[PDB]
Each structure stands twice: as structure tokens, then as C-alpha cells.
């Protein structure tokens, strides 16, 4: 018997931040975020005079409005003043003091989507040859061939992308949160990466507004405004974006497979929350690297168990098996490494219950395959309405028709 998903509206994005729908502004850089932020913005000259083109049907859409506009005006004073400063503090506007704040449905296909975008290969390389790993000593000879070969096929990977993006976010955040318990701080959204050719690069996202932040614990939340570059043009998936007011703000030149187009450049805006304990995972979403190899490297000691020698260059080289079922060792290593992500940037309770019950629903299933209620209940109470579970239940039942 296959899980029954839920019906209903559309699910809807519940990210901290843009996915597969993100817009990067960009430099080559020479370290300060808000003056690579400036640079960033100084780089598009298609700006236009921004207006509601998606609004939010629960929110006050003129104050986000007022929000971007403030932004640019506040942005643009700060390159009036004669030095930069390190740290901008918005004006406790009406728009930002409301931002700020001073049901079942079904699988849609674009979490589908998010997660194959995730597991692709982008341009650029987005962590360093040592990044994974946390060891106090040199490791061991195996151990190095390894990290090396996994590091070469993940480095580049869209979701090692959303782990850098997300590692920052989550450290500016969580240090203005005590730096500027008081202050709208203006939080600029970067990650950096190196070229093919080895240049460095820094990227802008968008911004972030926090709010008051006396985080007196874990759980204590912190509220936010994020406004979010785009080229996606929402009206396309409205469901997908029920919690945000869309802005359209500029007008971008690109080179496509037809030559030179111009495209609208969208501004997603939504009022967000996050407690220092959620901080504090996304600075380590760098342990999804590490676990994706640990999973890795669980394949290669059993194959070479079984062939009492070590398998670690036959298995990355693919040289008994006959075959790669995704295609590549690349693209396995990139599969693990974005359900990896996207546990931690989809985490939820709903994902829990799910993950432990699905798993005694799969051995039972497996012993009755290999030899021939409630617990279904128990899976089946986490498919309410989050996206990634969702998805985790669709493809569990492939697993069972198969
Ligand atoms: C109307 C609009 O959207 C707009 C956008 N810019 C670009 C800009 C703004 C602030 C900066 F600090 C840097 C660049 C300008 C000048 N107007």
C-alpha cells in the first residue's frame, strides 16, 4: 500500500532564502560586506522605479514597497558619506516597524525541480581543496585520496553553493543579533567563489533587514525582511511563492542561445524568523559535506571488504558492479550531498517523524521482499504540507512500486 499524500492547494517555498530561483550581482574582488554590497549594486545599470507585480495576499504590500525603496535611498546615502561605513542601521521607518513585526497541501512539482538544480554542476567552485574536515592531525594516505576525489566532484555543485550562501547568511545574521541588539541592521547576502580560470568572485543575493534581537536563548526568534534578486518571473508558479510580495525593479541584459535578451529583474520579498539554535546549524552546513563523503566512503569499505583490498581508486574511477544507476560517481556523490542540504535547509519535525518511521516501513517492506496500519499512520501524520517531505514520501513510493 502506497503512502496517501495529501490533497489540496499547492505547497508552497518555505526556504530561508532563494533556491534555484536566486539572482547573483557580481565582482571580481581585489572584504567589508556592505562595500562589496555597493560595488555589487554599482555593476547593474538597469535599474528602474520598482512596482508590485506579485503581491502578497496576507501581507501589507505598499511597506514591503516602501522597504526596497528605503534600502536604495538608505544605500544611497551611505555613498554620500565620505568613508563607507563598516555597518548600516536603518531608520526605524512605519514599513520596516510592521515588516518587522513591532492546513493541508499538495506535492507541486517544483521542489522536484529545486532538488535536481541542486544537484547540478555550476561554473564556478565554491569551497576550498581542504574545506571538509575538521581534523587536529595530518590524515592518512587513504583518507587524503578520498576527500580529494569527492572534493573534486562536489567543489563546483550547486548545493555546495546553497552551503556557503547559507553558512554566511546565518553568521552575519547571528553576530548582528548580538552586535546590534537594537538596530535594524541592513544585512547584505554575499557568498564568493573562483572562477575556472581562478578568479575570485564576490555575490551578491540581495539583503536582509533584522529586527530587535535581545536573544535571551536558543529558541528565541529574531525576525527579518529578505529581498531577494530574481529573474523568475512569479506569475508563472504563483503557488510557489504564497509568502512573498514580488517586485519588479530593473531590467538585465543576457547572452542566451538566441544572442542578446532582455529580461525583468524581480525582487522577491518576505518577512522571515530564525532562533540562535537555527543560526548556529546553518553556520555548520559545511557537516553536509562531511557527511556526504562518510556516506561515500561507507560504499568504498564495503566493497573492499569484500575484495580484501582497499577500492577507493576503483570506485571513484569506475573501473563486481557493472554500472553507475545515476549515471556517474559524480552524480552520486552530488545526490547525497543535496538531500544532505536540503535536510538542513528543509528542517522541520515533519521531516523527523518521517525520516525514522519511513525507515521501519523500508526494512519491514525489504524483509518481505527478499522472503516472499499505525505505523502508516505514523508516517503518514508528517505529509501535511512541507514541500521536502513531501517529496521524500513521492519517492518512497517509487520505492515500494518498485
Ligand atoms: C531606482 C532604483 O532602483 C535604483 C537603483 N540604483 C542603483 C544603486 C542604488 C544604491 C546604491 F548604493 C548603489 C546602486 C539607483 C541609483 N536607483
Given at each position: 500500500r502506497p503512502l496517501r499524500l495529501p490533497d489540496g492547494p499547492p505547497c508552497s517555498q518555505r526556504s530561508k532564502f532563494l533556491l534555484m530561483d536566486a539572482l547573483k550581482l557580481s565582482?571580481?574582488?581585489?572584504?567589508?560586506?556592505?562595500?562589496?554590497?555597493?560595488?555589487?549594486?554599482?555593476?547593474?545599470?538597469?535599474?528602474?522605479?520598482?512596482?508590485?507585480?506579485?503581491?502578497?495576499?496576507?501581507?501589507?504590500?505598499?511597506?514591503?514597497?516602501?522597504?526596497?525603496?528605503?534600502?536604495?535611498?538608505?544605500?544611497?546615502?551611505?555613498?554620500?558619506?565620505?568613508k563607507i561605513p563598516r555597518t548600516?542601521?536603518?531608520?526605524?521607518?512605519?514599513?520596516?516597524?510592521?515588516?518587522?513585526?513591532?492546513?493541508?497541501?499538495?506535492?507541486?512539482?517544483?521542489?522536484?525541480?529545486?532538488?535536481?538544480?541542486?544537484?547540478?554542476?555550476?561554473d564556478s567552485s565554491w569551497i576550498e581543496l581542504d574545506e571538509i574536515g575538521e581534523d587536529?592531525?595530518?590524515?592518512?594516505?587513504?583518507?587524503?585520496?578520498?576527500?580529494?576525489?569527492?572534493?573534486?566532484?562536489?567543489?563546483?555543485?550547486?548545493?555546495?553553493?546553497?552551503?556557503?550562501?547559507?553558512?554566511?547568511?546565518?553568521?552575519?545574521?547571528?553576530?548582528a543579533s548580538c552586535a546590534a541588539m537594537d538596530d535594524f541592521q541592513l544585512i547584505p547576502m554575499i557568498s564568493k567563489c573562483r572562477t575556472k580560470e581562478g578568479r575570485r568572485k564576490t555575490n551578491l543575493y540581495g539583503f536582509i533587514i533584522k529586527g530587535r534581537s535581545h536573544?535571551?536563548?536558543?529558541?528565541?526568534?529574531?525576525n527579518f525582511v529578505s529581498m531577494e534578486f530574481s529573474?523568475?518571473?512569479?506569475?508563472?508558479?504563483?503557488?510557489?511563492?504564497?509568502?512573498?510580495?514580488?517586485?519588479?525593479?530593473?531590467?538585465?541584459?543576457?547572452?542566451?542561445?538566441?544572442?542578446?535578451?532582455?529580461?525583468?529583474?524581480?525582487?522577491?520579498?518576505?518577512?522571515?524568523?530564525?532562533?540562535?539554535?537555527?543560526?548556529?546549524?546553518?553556520?555548520?552546513?559545511?557537516?553536509?559535506?562531511?557527511?556526504?563523503?562518510?556516506?561515500?566512503?561507507?560504499?568504498?569499505?564495503?566493497?573492499?571488504?569484500?575484495?580484501?583490498?582497499?577500492?577507493?581508486?576503483?570506485?571513484?574511477?569506475?573501473?563486481?558492479?557493472?554500472?553507475?544507476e545515476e549515471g556517474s560517481i559524480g552524480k552520486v556523490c552530488r545526490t547525497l550531498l543535496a538531500k544532505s542540504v536540503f535536510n538542513s535547509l528543509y528542517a522541520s519535525p515533519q521531516?523527523?517523524?518521517?525520516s525514522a518511521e519511513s525507515r521501519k516501513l523500508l526494512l519491514i517492506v525489504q524483509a518481505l521482499r527478499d522472503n516472499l496500519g499505525g505505523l502508516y499512520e505514523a508516517i503518514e501524520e508528517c505529509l501535511i504540507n512541507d514541500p521536502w517531505v513531501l517529496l521524500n514520501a513521492s519517492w518512497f513510493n517509487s520505492f515500494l512500486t518498485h
Open positions: 565582482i571580481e574582488d581585489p572584504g567589508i560586506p556592505l562595500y562589496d554590497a555597493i560595488k555589487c549594486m554599482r555593476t547593474f545599470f538597469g535599474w528602474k522605479e520598482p512596482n508590485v507585480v506579485k503581491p502578497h495576499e496576507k501581507g501589507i504590500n505598499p511597506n514591503y514597497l516602501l522597504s526596497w525603496k528605503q534600502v536604495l535611498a538608505e544605500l544611497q546615502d551611505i555613498e554620500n558619506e565620505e548600516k542601521n536603518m531608520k526605524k521607518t512605519s514599513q520596516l516597524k510592521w515588516a518587522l513585526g513591532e492546513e493541508l497541501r499538495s506535492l507541486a512539482s517544483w521542489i522536484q525541480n529545486e532538488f535536481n538544480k541542486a544537484c547540478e554542476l555550476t587536529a592531525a595530518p590524515i592518512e594516505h587513504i583518507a587524503s585520496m578520498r576527500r580529494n576525489y569527492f572534493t573534486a566532484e562536489v567543489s563546483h555543485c550547486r548545493a555546495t553553493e546553497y552551503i556557503m550562501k547559507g553558512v554566511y547568511i546565518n553568521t552575519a545574521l547571528l553576530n536573544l535571551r536563548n536558543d529558541t528565541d526568534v529574531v529573474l523568475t518571473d512569479p506569475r508563472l508558479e504563483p503557488h510557489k511563492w504564497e509568502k512573498y510580495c514580488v517586485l519588479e525593479v530593473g531590467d538585465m541584459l543576457l547572452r542566451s542561445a538566441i544572442g542578446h535578451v532582455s529580461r525583468p529583474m524581480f525582487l522577491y520579498v518576505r518577512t522571515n524568523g530564525t532562533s540562535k539554535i537555527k543560526m548556529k546549524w546553518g553556520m555548520e552546513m559545511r557537516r553536509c559535506l562531511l557527511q556526504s563523503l562518510q556516506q561515500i566512503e561507507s560504499m568504498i569499505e564495503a566493497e573492499s571488504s569484500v575484495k580484501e583490498k582497499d577500492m577507493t581508486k576503483e570506485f571513484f574511477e569506475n573501473k563486481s558492479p557493472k554500472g553507475v521531516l523527523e517523524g518521517f
